[PDB]
């Protein structure tokens, strides 16, 4: 407005990154 | 051992003499990867 290969990291609740 | 190496050297000499003058349903390992198994991708990598 006024300004003008990896994978998807899944995190559930406080669980740091679903592996 | 040495006799097979001498036979291979004689075959290479005959091949160079014929080049200076089928595939038997085989697999050529020097042309490409024989059974290409790609590594699994995850969480990283930007290739090279």
């Amino acid at each position: 407005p006024e300004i003008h290969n990896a994978l998807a990291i899944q995190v559930d609740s406080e669980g740091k990154i679903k592996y | 051992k040495a006799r097979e190496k001498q036979l291979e050297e004689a075959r290479r000499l005959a091949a160079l003499q014929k080049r200076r003058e089928k595939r038997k349903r085989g697999v050529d390992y020097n042309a490409e990867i024989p059974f290409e198994k790609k590594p699994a991708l995850g969480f990283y990598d930007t290739s090279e």
């Binding site: - | 390992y29 990867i33 024989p34 198994k37 590594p39 995850g42 990283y44 930007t46 090279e48």
Partner: protein
């Protein structure tokens, strides 16, 4: 010379493929083929060889170790991180994978967030050397409240008199005397309260002799009343001092 080198490489690859096809389960042929492919500077060919060998038998430690070492010896750091992530998620009980992953991500990687990755190992309740190395790693990263939580989880997960003595020494060396006294009180209340171990009482008496000799004499008298030869030696040391 290029055609002779191509014929030599074709003959070596034909003998390696014939040795693979003769005995599939022998992994030393796979290791020799992968090392010969890496010695000729063919990284993706050796990666395909290692992936085929892991598809043949994924339970071997040395296949993962050699393929991660081949990834780490080159500049493929993210490939090595993917290899270590796969090796951790398939075989969590092998501690050598964890140790080499932490040395790769700590020395070469130099990432503190790998400690969070290390907390994944703390889900698995490992042996006490993992806890000791994590205590020394948190000391090397200059964190003492985090190391206090680490040692509290170590005492809760692996309770031992040597573990409580190491907790007392770590709380004394981190200049928390009230926390050390509370840890010694909790160890006296829980660890060997009725078992009469007579070793955590000696450490509590040594901490009190560092603190105040009247409480050390009271602790030595309580240890002599609760009880061996070491308790009598500690009582004689408290009476002599």
């Amino acid at each position: 010379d290029e055609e002779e080198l191509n014929d030599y490489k074709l003959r070596k690859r034909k003998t390696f493929e014939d040795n693979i096809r003769k005995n599939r389960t022998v992994i030393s042929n796979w290791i020799k083929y992968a090392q010969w492919e890496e010695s000729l500077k063919e990284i993706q060919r050796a990666r395909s060889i290692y992936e085929r060998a892991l598809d043949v038998d994924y339970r071997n430690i040395t296949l993962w170790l050699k393929y991660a070492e081949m990834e780490m010896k080159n500049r493929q750091v993210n490939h090595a991180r993917n290899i270590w992530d796969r090796a951790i998620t398939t075989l969590p009980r092998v501690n050598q994978f964890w140790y080499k992953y932490t040395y790769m991500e700590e020395m070469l990687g130099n990432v503190a967030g790998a400690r969070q990755v290390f907390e994944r190992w703390m889900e698995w309740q490992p042996e006490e050397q993992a806890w000791h190395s994590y205590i020394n790693f948190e000391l090397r990263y200059k964190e003492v409240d985090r190391a206090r939580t680490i040692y509290e989880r170590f005492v809760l997960v692996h309770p031992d008199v040597k573990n409580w003595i190491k907790y007392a020494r770590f709380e004394e060396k981190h200049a928390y005397f009230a926390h050390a006294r509370k840890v010694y009180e909790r160890a006296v209340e829980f660890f060997g309260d009725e078992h009469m171990d007579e070793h955590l009482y000696v450490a509590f008496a040594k901490f009190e002799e560092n603190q105040k000799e009247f409480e050390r004499v009271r602790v030595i008298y309580k240890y002599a009343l609760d009880r061996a030869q070491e308790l009598f030696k500690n009582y004689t040391i408290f009476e002599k001092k």
